């Protein structure tokens, strides 16, 4: 209704419907700390909040008091909770929040307190339906966005919608092949149906993340990808990887490429390998190259790798 | 000379491969403007100039815990994070906390608490895992018998009964979700006031471990993208907990070591995101835990005098990216000056100075000598002689239990 910055926005100690009701202010003791010097609005709004709050009252009035005390300050979990507790109480038109929701989150995108409401009307609704476009639409603002990246998860799961979740992983690494949070959804799809023990998905994942390796060689998301679904299972049992690997090493170099190298020797040594030190010099090479000068920035930790290769494979 | 500065430090820009997307693209201008800044110390230099603005750190700290502009509405249900951010770097910047402002804060807190347990975001709101975990920190960090006797254990143990549910995992409030987070802000809460029962975090550590992913970090709840924030209360729960062999530490520490970002030298929060001085703490906080945890399980490869991770370069991307002239530290130049990353930022300072490990100890402080900050235990994120003072204390008094659940079962009017 009344919006807090109309020309005609009334305060609620001036409004002839909330009369009756004594504002309670909030008390921050006798010398405050950390006192934030709140507009007249804002502790207006939240001294009749508090009132509503105290007397339990379960109003219409408290009801849409809630949605100014939201735009005060959409991070108050307490107004936001309450808010809730209303929409049953009056039996409120769940579809019509549902509105107010998309507009505020469109809004605050990465506000959690946002979402988490959200999340609470699609299981009361038990509806699902707008969720995985509305989803795309903010991700199309941020494709990044944890918040909308968690919620997508909990809908995929909860209704069980996997059915095109993988196709929609593929649009958005088309649109950005490095949107690690997508290389991670592709995951959490995978994870979840196939699986990763089925060795012709797995096959198609590790050919796919090669070619993705290939067009960006210095992409880290796709290099974490391939370690990801193979590091459990292995890197040394893999020896037509390790060669496609070598063969990269010209035109598509990276740190990354010679840190998964590194891992295969590592090991290859673990699995009591053949020529043990013919290994563990390719390893150790590998770590002082990473350390003095292709991964200066982690010479700590390939100081550390190197160190402990040596501690239980020499000698 | 200074890692940023040196002249092979350009070799470690960004090759986007000639393949351009949203994210190398945004890299790139960060990288941009970072370098700008690094070029004005190469650039100028007769008297020494990596200097923290101590000074205007403090007066904007000062003036922070107690009055605040609207600017800070926003975090009216957050009051006892902003208590703790300021006490906390203060702390780091060793500025002792007056007797009067110190009774202030004690009683502010005391309003903040739930007459049914925890600490809300502010007087009259429901309690809440964060401000909780926030509260008790700052309250450790004044760390006096007044601050200590605000906490009403009993009641804190109750709380967190309210929120821990059957699969180990704790909700962030009543009627809230759940994520690595409240489990952390559990855990450290229980453990400082001394109020862990036998059964209060029973399952607690498989849940948590359950959020580690593929890459080797985790995510808020399982399935998650590895994230830095989430990853710091992950670890951090379970060395409470003593369950961090609960995780693959190795891909764990292979993840983390990856998130300094080798031109900016600070860390990102995920892999391919951008560099922010909050991560000099939620990521390098991760080192000295791993460092621990290793330890503890007899690595013999371990550095008695380095985290692994490198402290130059972080320290370099903070006094020289994140300081703000007005006080205040930020996420990058010209980017979010407030207390949280005031306090981070400072946090990860801390860190990448002071290394430790049984009796070896070795600082490295880039800059003036006088850039060194109070140390900061890894875990809890508050002195390690406020740590200690606590635990000792609360400690003094037995952990709290719910007699009714010991007594015989009943079954029959009869026997009355
Ligand atoms: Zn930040």
């Known amino acids: 209704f009344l919006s807090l910055d109309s020309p005609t926005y009334v305060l609620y100690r001036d409004r002839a419907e909330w009369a009756d009701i004594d504002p309670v202010p909030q008390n921050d003791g006798p010398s405050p700390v950390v006192q934030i010097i709140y507009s007249e609005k804002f502790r207006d709004v939240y001294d009749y909040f508090r009132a509503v709050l105290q007397r339990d009252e379960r109003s219409e009035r408290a009801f849409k008091l809630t949605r100014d005390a939201i735009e005060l300050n959409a991070a108050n979990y307490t107004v936001w909770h309450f808010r809730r507790v209303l929409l049953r109480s009056l039996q409120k038109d769940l579809q019509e929040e549902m509105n107010y929701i998309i507009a505020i989150i469109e809004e605050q995108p990465k506000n959690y307190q946002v979402w988490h409401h959200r999340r609470v009307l699609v299981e009361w ?68 149906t196939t699986g990763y023990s089925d060795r012709a998905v797995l096959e198609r994942e590790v050919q796919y993340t090669l070619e993705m390796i290939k067009l960006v060689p210095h992409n880290e998301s796709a290099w974490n990808y391939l370690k990801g679904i193979l590091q459990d299972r292995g890197l040394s049992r893999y020896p037509n990887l390790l060669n496609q690997l070598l063969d990269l090493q010209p035109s598509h170099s990276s740190p990354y490429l010679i840190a998964f190298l590194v891992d295969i020797y590592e090991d290859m040594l673990e699995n009591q390998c053949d020529n043990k030190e013919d290994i563990l010099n390719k390893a150790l090479e590998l770590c002082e190259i990473l350390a003095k000068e292709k991964d200066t920035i982690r010479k700590e930790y390939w100081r550390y790798i190197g160190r402990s290769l040596q501690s239980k494979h020499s000698r | 000379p200074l890692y940023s500065l040196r002249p092979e430090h350009a070799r470690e820009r960004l090759q986007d491969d000639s393949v351009e997307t949203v994210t190398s693209i945004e890299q790139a201008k960060v990288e941009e403007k970072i370098q700008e800044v690094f070029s004005s110390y190469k650039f100028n230099h007769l008297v020494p100039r990596l200097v923290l603005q101590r000074e205007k750190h403090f007066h904007y700290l000062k003036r922070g815990l107690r009055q605040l502009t609207d600017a800070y509405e926003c975090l009216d249900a957050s009051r006892p994070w902003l208590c703790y951010w300021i006490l906390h770097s203060l702390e780091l910047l060793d500025e002792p906390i007056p007797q009067i402002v110190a009774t202030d804060v004690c009683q502010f807190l005391e309003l903040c608490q739930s007459p049914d347990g925890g600490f809300g975001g502010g007087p009259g709101q429901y309690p809440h895992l964060a401000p909780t975990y926030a509260a008790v920190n ?131 929060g995920r892999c391919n995101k951008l560099v922010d001085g909050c991560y000099s703490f939620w990521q390098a906080g991760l080192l000295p835990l791993l460092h621990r945890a290793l330890h503890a399980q007899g690595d013999p490869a371990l550095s008695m005098s380095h985290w692994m991770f490198h402290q130059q370069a972080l320290q370099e991307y903070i006094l020289m990216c994140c300081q703000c002239p007005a006080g205040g530290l930020l996420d990058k130049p010209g980017k979010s000056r407030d207390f949280y990353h005031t306090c981070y930022c400072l946090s990860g300072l801390s860190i990448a100075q002071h290394f430790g490990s049984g009796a070896m100890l070795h600082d490295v402080v880039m800059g003036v000598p006088e850039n060194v900050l109070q140390p900061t235990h890894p875990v809890y994120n508050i002195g390690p002689d406020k740590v200690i003072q606590a635990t000792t204390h609360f400690l003094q008094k037995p952990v709290p239990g719910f007699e009714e659940c010991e007594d015989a079962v009943t079954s029959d009017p009869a026997t009355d």
Request: with cysteine.
């Open chain 1, 125 to 192: 609704l038990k509806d699902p339906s707008q969720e995985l476009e509305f989803i795309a639409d903010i991700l199309n603002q941020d494709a990044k966005n944890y918040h909308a990246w968690q919620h997508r998860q909990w809908v995929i799961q909860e209704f069980r919608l996997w059915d095109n979740e993988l196709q929609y992983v593929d649009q958005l690494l088309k649109e950005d092949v490095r949107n690690n949070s997508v290389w991670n959804q592709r995951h959490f799809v995978i994870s979840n």
């Open chain 2, 138 to 268: 700052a309250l450790c960090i004044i760390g006096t018998e007044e601050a200590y006797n605000v906490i009403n254990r009993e009641k804190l143990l109750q709380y967190l009964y309210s929120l821990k549910q059957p699969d180990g995992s704790f909700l962030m409030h009543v009627g809230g979700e759940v994520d690595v987070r409240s489990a952390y802000c559990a855990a450290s809460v229980a453990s400082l006031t001394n109020i862990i029962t036998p059964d209060l975090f029973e399952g607690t550590a498989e849940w948590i471990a359950r959020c580690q992913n593929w890459e080797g970090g985790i995510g808020g709840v399982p399935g998650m993208e590895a994230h830095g924030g989430y990853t710091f209360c992950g670890l951090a729960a379970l060395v409470i907990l003593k369950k961090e062999r609960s995780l693959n530490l190795k891909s764990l520490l292979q993840w983390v070591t990856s998130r300094q970002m080798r031109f900016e030298g600070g860390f990102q």
